[PDB]
Amino acid sequence: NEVGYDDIGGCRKQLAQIKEMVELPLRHPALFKAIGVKPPRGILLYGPPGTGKTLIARAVANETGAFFFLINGPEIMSKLAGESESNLRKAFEEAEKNAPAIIFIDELDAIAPKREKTHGEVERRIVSQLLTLMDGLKQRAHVIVMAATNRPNSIDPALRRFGRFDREVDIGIPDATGRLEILQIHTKNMKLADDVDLEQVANETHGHVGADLAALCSEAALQAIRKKMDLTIDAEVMNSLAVTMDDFRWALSQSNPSALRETVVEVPQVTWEDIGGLEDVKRELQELVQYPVEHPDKFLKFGMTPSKGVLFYGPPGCGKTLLAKAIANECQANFISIKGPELLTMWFGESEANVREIFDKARQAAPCVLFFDELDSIAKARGGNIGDGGGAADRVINQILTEMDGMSTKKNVFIIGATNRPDIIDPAILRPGRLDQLIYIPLPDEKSRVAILKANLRKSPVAKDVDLEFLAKMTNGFSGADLTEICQRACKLAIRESIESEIRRERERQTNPSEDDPVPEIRRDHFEEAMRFARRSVSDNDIRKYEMFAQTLQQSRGFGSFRFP
Amino acid sequence: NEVGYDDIGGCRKQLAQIKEMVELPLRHPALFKAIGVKPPRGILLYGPPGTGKTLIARAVANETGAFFFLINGPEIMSKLAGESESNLRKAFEEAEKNAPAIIFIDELDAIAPKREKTHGEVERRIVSQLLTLMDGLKQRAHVIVMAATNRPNSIDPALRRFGRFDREVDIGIPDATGRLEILQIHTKNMKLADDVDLEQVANETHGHVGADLAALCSEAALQAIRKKMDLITIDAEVMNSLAVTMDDFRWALSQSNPSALRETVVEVPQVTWEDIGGLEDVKRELQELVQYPVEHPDKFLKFGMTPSKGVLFYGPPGCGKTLLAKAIANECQANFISIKGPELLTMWFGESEANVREIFDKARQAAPCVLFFDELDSIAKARGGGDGGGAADRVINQILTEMDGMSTKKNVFIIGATNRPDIIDPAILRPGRLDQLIYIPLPDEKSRVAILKANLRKSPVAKDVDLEFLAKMTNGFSGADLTEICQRACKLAIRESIESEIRRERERQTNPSEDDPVPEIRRDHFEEAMRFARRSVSDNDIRKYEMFAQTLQQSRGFGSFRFP
Amino acid sequence: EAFPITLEWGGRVVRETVYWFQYESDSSLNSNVYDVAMKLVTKHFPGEFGSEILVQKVVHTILHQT
C-alpha cells in the first residue's frame, strides 16, 4: 500500500538527483534552518506522460516520512469557480500543518497552461492564487512542492520564476537498462517460462515507457491465458500458465509505443571496436571531449578554453555517426542525434525557434555530445552551390549559431557536425568560438573493414569457415554501408535457403508421410553469392572531392619551420 | 534586522540614482515646498527577475524612515472581483495615513500587462482603478510608488504617462564587481577555506543574477555538507567546523543554469589599449570622437561643432575591431553594448525589425555608451554578395530611422564593423549617420607582440620563450591566428601533462612506493604549434581593403590650399 | 596581365580589355581596382544612371581575375 525506492525503475539518475535534493532537507528539518541555506521551495519534474512521476513523489515522501498530498489538475479545474481556490488553499494549509510535507501537483499544465491558452477570468485567477501560494512558502517550514508537466514551456512562465518552481528534473524516457529494470519490476508477480530473456525484450522495446511496458506485460499474460483459457484463481493452474517468449514477441508485435517521436537521450552502446580505425581521429576526439571532463584542472592550470565543438566531413555512410557515438560512450556522456529531416522540417515550417529547445535539452543532460546529422540539409535544399539566389545564412543554421554563442563552456556540452558536402556549409559556423575544427573521415582501410564486418555479423550465427579477414582484403573501397549491405545480402540468401528447405521438407512429408537444420549458419557460398551482388556506393572521383578539400585546407597550413633561436 | 544599503550589492549606480531621486524629498519634505519644485510620483524599476528590486525598495525605505507598503501583483489578481479593487484602493488610502511613505507594487505586469495581452473586462477595470489612484497621488502628501516590472513594454503605456510611472531605473544585470559584492553578501555567514577566492567565481559567473549567485552559494555549501555528511539542532562542532573549498564552488558552478545568459549585457569593458597596443592613428580618431565630447562639452559649445554620431570600422576578418571598440569604451569609462551579426539576421528572418527601437532605447537609457554593431553586412551577405534589389533592407532601414531620431545631447555613440566595406548600404554612410570610415589593418609587429602577450596573460609561460621572435616571423597573421597559435600551444602542453601523469600512475602501479612534469608551456610546444599555423587572410583579401582605403578617403584630398 | 571585362547595364554590351600594371617600383602606377572600374565605366558608359552597381560588378570581376 506504500511505495518505496525499490518499486521505482528506469530513472535511477533522476531518482538520485531528487534524493540528494530533497531527502537531506526533509530528514533533518531543524539542522537545515540552523545552517544558512534554503532548500528547494518547489521542484518541477517533466517528461512524456506514463513514466510514473507520481510514483517518484510518493516514494520520496514515504522514504523521508514526510506527509504527502496529491493535487489532480483536472480534478481542481472540475470544481466550480470559487471552490477551486478554496481547495488549493486548503491543500497548502493542510500540507503546512503536517510539516514536513510534499505537495505533488499532477498535471500542472491543466491548472496553469500557457498564458495564451488561458482565456477566462477564473482561469487566470486560479493561476494567480497558485502563484501567491507559491510565494507564501517562505514563511512555511519544510514544505516542498513538486509539479509534473510534459515540457517546461507547457506551463505559465510566471510559475518558473525564482522562489516558485525553480528546480527542474527531466525524467525523460527509460533506456535499455531502465527498460529491463521496469520489466523486472512489473513481472515480479507473473509466473514466467525459462525461455524469456527480459534483456532481449528490453532491447527490442524501443520507445516504450513504464506504462507501455506494463501494458505489454499484461498483454503477454492475457495471451497466455487465452492459449490456456478453455482448459477463485487456482495457484497451480496459474503456475502452469507460464508465459513464454513467443507470447512476449506477440505482444511486442501488438503493442503501440507512446514515445516513439520523443528525443532519445542515453549513453550510446557503440565502442571503438565497432570501427577500429583512424587512430588520429580517436586521439583528437579524446582530447576534445574526454580531457575537459576528466582533467578540468589542467585547463585552468594552463588557462585554456575547451573547444566548443568539431566538424566532420566525408563520403556518405562511413562512420561519421559511429565515431560520435563511440566518443560519447568513452566519456560516458549522453548523446543527442539531430537527423537532417528534423532540420528540414524546422526550415519548411519556419519553426527555427525549436533550436533553443534542442540546445536547452542538451545543456540539461550535461555532459553530452550534441550531434547534428546533416548541417548541409537545408543548404542543399535551397540548391546548394548549384543554385543560390541568396547566401549561406539561413534560419536554422542562424539559430544554431546564436545558441552555440550563448552557451557556457562550464557545461561540458560539445557540438559535433556531420556532412557529406562541406563546401556548402555556412562559413559562420566554422569561425573560432564555434565548431572551428574540420576532421576528414576517409573510407575504412583493411583493419577498419575487418572490424566493420565483425561488428555487422556479431548477431548473425555465422559459420566458422568464414574468413572475414580475407573478405576485407578484396572489398577495398567499400564503405561501412556497403559492408552492411554485404552482410544483409548474405543473411537474406541464408534465410531464403532455410525457408525453401523447410518448405521442401513439408512437401516431402506430404508426398511420403511417415530432424536437422539444413542451413544452421551462414555458409561461405552465401557470402560468395552476395559479393557478386555488391557495388561501391562512393566512386573514386567522388573521393577526389574530399581529398581535394583536405589538400586545400592543409596547403594553408605552413610555417612548419619555426626555429626560434 | 532591517534591510539597508549594505545589505544590497551589484546595483551601486542604480542604488545611488534611486537615493538621489527619493532620499532628499522624503527626508526633507519642507525643502521642496519652499523651492516649489516637483518631486517624483512613481519610479518604475525594470530588469530580469531575481535582481532584488524589492530589496532595493525596502532598503531605500528603511534608510529614510517613512513607511513601506508592499503590493504583490499576483496577490491582487488572485482575489475575487471587487476585492482586488478594494485592496488596491485601501493600500493607497492607508499609505497616506503613515506618510511620507513608499509603496512597492511587485509584479506590475500581472496587474496591468500590455493591453494586447488582456481579454476580460475586470482586467481593464483594475488597470483603470490603478490609473485613477495614480492621478490622485499627485496631490497626496509625499507618497511615492516604486513598481517593478520585467521591461517597459511589459505594462500598459497608460501607466507610463506624466503624473504616473514616468521616471525609470534600469537595475540590469550585475557585472563582475557586482557579482563579487553579491557573493560577499551571501557568503558573510559561511566558513570557507583559504583556497577560495570569490574574485575568481565572480569573474567567471557570467550571466548570473542576484538570485542565481545565492543558489550557487547554497549548492556549494550543501555539496560540502553532503561530501562530509556521509562520513559523519546540529552535530555541534562537526558542522561548526564545516569549511567550504574552491572545488565545491567549482562543482556547484558547473551544476548551475544561470537565468540571464541571453540578456544584453551592459557594462564597462575591461579591455585596455595595451591589449591591441597599436594603431595610434585609430586611437586618436576614437579619442576625438568618443572622449572629448564627454570630457570637454564646453569646448564643443564654445565652437559651433556638433559631435559626430558614430564611425564605421572595416577590414579583414578578426583583426581587433571589437577589441578597439571595447578599449575606447574602457578609456572613457562608458558602457558597451554589442550587437552580433546573428541578432541582425534573426531580426531580418523573423521580420522583427521593430526591436531596433528597443536596442536604441537600451543604449539611450545607459549613457554614455558605445553601441557597437559587429556585422552590419550580415544581411547584405545573406541576400547575396545579390538577389536583384537595392542595398536597402528592413533592419538597416530601422537602424537609420533610430539614428536620425537620436538627440546629440545624449552621448550614445554608434560603431559599425564589416568585412565588405563596398556592399554596405550607402545610406548608412551619409553625413549625419556614421560619417567616418576607419580602416583596421592587419596587426603590425609591435601590435602582434602586444596581442601575443595579452593572450598568454593567463597561461604560465616559461621565461625562455620570447614573444618578440614569434611575432617577427609571423608577419601577415591576424589576431585570430595568433590566438589560435596560443591555444594550440596550450592544448599541446595539456596533452603532454596528461600523458606524463598517466606514465607516473603506471610507475606507481608497478612500483607502489614527485614533482610536476611540465609546469610551464615549454618552448617546444610553441615550436610544434607554429606548424599548425596558417595565415587566415590572403594577400588577395588584403588587396580589397588596401584599394578601398587608397581610393576612398584619398581620392581627392587635393589640399595644397592657402589663403593669400 | 590583361583580362577582359564587358559592361552590361540597361541592356547593353561592349568589348574591352583591362590592363594591369602591378609590381611597378613606385607603387603608384600599380593598378587600383576601383580607379580602373570607374575609368572603364565612364569611358564606355559615360553619364549612365545607377552606375554604382556596374562599378561594383566590375570591381568584383577585377578582384576575381587578379
Author numbering:
A (entry chain A): 199 to 429, 436 to 718, 724 to 774
B (entry chain B): 199 to 430, 436 to 588, 591 to 718, 724 to 774
C (entry chain H): 590 to 655
Wording from the paper:
The AAA+ ATPase valosin-containing protein (VCP)/p97, known as cdc48 in Saccharomyces cerevisiae, is an essential and highly conserved protein involved in numerous cellular functions, such as regulating protein homeostasis, endolysosomal trafficking, membrane remodeling, chromatin regulation, autophagy, Golgi formation, and others. Its core function is to unfold ubiquitylated proteins in an ATP dependent fashion. Previous studies have established that post-mitotic Golgi reassembly requires presence of VCP, as well as two adapter proteins, VCPIP138, and p4734,35.
To provide a structural basis of how these two cofactors simultaneously interact with VCP and a framework for understanding this process, we determined the first structure of VCP in a ternary complex with VCPIP1 and p47 using cryo-EM. After initial rounds of 3D classification, we were again able to observe density in the two binding regions on VCP, similar to what we observed for the VCP-VCPIP1 complex (see “Methods” and Supplementary Figs. 6, 7 for details). We used a combination of symmetry expansion and focused refinement to zoom in on these regions. We obtained a 3.1 Å reconstruction revealing three VCPIDs bound at the C-terminal end of VCP without symmetry expansion, and a 4.0 Å reconstruction of the N-domain region with symmetry expansion. The binding mode of the three VCPIDs bound to the D2 dimer is indistinguishable from the binding mode observed in the VCP-VCPIP1 complex, with the stalk regions connected to each VCPID clearly visible. Since the interactions between VCP and the VCPID in all structures are unchanged, we conclude that p47 binding does not affect how VCPIP1 engages the D2 domains of the VCP hexamer. The p47 UBX domain competitively binds to the VCP N-domain, while not affecting VCPID binding. Taken together, the cryo-EM structure of VCP-VCPIP1-p47 complex reveals how VCP is able to engage with p47 and VCPIP1 simultaneously and maps key points of interaction between VCP and the two adapter proteins involved in mediating Golgi reassembly. Given that these interactions are maintained in the context of the VCP-VCPIP1-p47 complex we report here, we expect that they play a key role in ensuring efficient Syn5 deubiquitylation for membrane fusion.
